[PDB]
């Protein structure tokens, strides 16, 4: 079941304007891009693209209200500049298990105003020295990187 199918399977005869949390993981990508979602999704605030073979997020929809996006287990190697404009209100991003290999790749996220968490587990960029410090200086608004704030104090629950 590719995205276009499961989306409708998850649409559940409920109009796109009335979805607030959509879960689409392990499904597929057309070739390496999200296909099936459309801008009519306006009430969505939790999209989970986990394990969907995804080579980029170029053709992502426009979700004003998105706040909890997660692209873990995919193979994004850049092109995150789109997420800034297309998800102005995103405040919880989960890029774990992807193919990011440089701090430069995370430069585009600097212009997201309301960012609160960035999970970056199992990514080749996490093997660097002064990794967390460099990330926290490139993304000053961040207050939880990988789960801990600044002194390795776990992020409080109920987020």
């Amino acid at each position: 079941m590719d995205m276009k199918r499961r989306i409708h399977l998850e649409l559940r005869n409920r109009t796109p304007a009335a979805v607030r949390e959509l879960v689409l993981d392990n499904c597929k990508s057309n070739d390496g891009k999200i296909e099936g979602l459309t801008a009519e999704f306006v009430n969505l605030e939790f999209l989970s693209l986990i394990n969907v073979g995804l080579i980029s997020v170029s053709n992502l929809p426009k979700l004003p209200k998105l706040k909890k996006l997660e692209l873990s287990e995919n193979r994004i190697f850049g092109g995150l500049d789109m997420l800034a404009e297309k998800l102005p209100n995103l405040t919880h991003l989960n890029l774990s298990g992807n193919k990011l290999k440089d701090i430069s790749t995370l430069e585009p996220l600097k212009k997201l105003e309301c960012l609160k968490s960035l999970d970056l587990f199992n990514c080749e960029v996490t093997n660097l020295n002064d990794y967390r410090e460099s990330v926290f200086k490139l993304l000053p608004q961040l207050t939880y990187l990988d789960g801990y704030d600044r002194e390795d104090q776990e992020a409080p629950d109920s987020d």
């Binding site: 093997n127 660097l128 020295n129 002064d130 002194e151 390795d152």
Partner: protein, 51 residues
């Protein structure tokens, strides 16, 4: 090596005391040693040492 050169949230080496520092050379030695021990007490290299 990159991860072995990083700080941690712990204090792995707990050294003991030394006599008072009277001689100026003693003061310089104590200053160097204290700065170093502060910079290396919390570290993953010390974790490997103690483990």
């Amino acid at each position: 090596f990159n991860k072995a050169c990083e700080l941690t949230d712990s204090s792995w080496i707990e050294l003991d005391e030394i006599g008072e520092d009277v001689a100026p050379i003693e003061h310089i030695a104590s200053m160097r040693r204290n700065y170093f021990t502060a910079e290396v007490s919390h570290c993953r290299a010390t974790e490997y040492i103690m483990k």
